[PDB]
Amino acid sequence: SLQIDIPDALSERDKVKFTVHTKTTLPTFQSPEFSVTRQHEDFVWLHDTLIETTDYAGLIIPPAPTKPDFDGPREKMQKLGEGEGSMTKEEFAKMKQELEAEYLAVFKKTVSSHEVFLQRLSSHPVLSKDRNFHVFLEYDQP
């Protein structure tokens, strides 16, 4: 079996980090359980690479994940304090709490899109076997 989930993620400056966790029985992997850190572009790279593969001409590659956008929430958070002085402590806390809820919503949607893409790949009997997909899953220089 090939089981992939995204346990955790980080949003920073303008960059988003996903943790891609793999559980597998397959002999082809060096280890049964491992985790790596990947960025949205890495997901895009995999999709494009699968598309390029001559052998997969007759298969439909799963659509790439949507690029994550945290711009509204990040922009608001910077502004929030920012004007910490202007407002009361309860006002500040409630606002910070609100903006956090927003981050979480964006997180839930983007995490799902990235995870679903990987899960579709593992579903495919041919695609799961792909060498590039494997490297994406467990290559860890650090």
Binding site: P7, S11, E12, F70, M77, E100, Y103, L104, V111
Partner: peptide
Amino acid sequence: GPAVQFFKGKNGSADQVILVTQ
């Protein structure tokens, strides 16, 4: 502005977001 760290809930555990130094 701070980084935000997301933890997917260990179901049925709720998802969490935490403010990270940056």
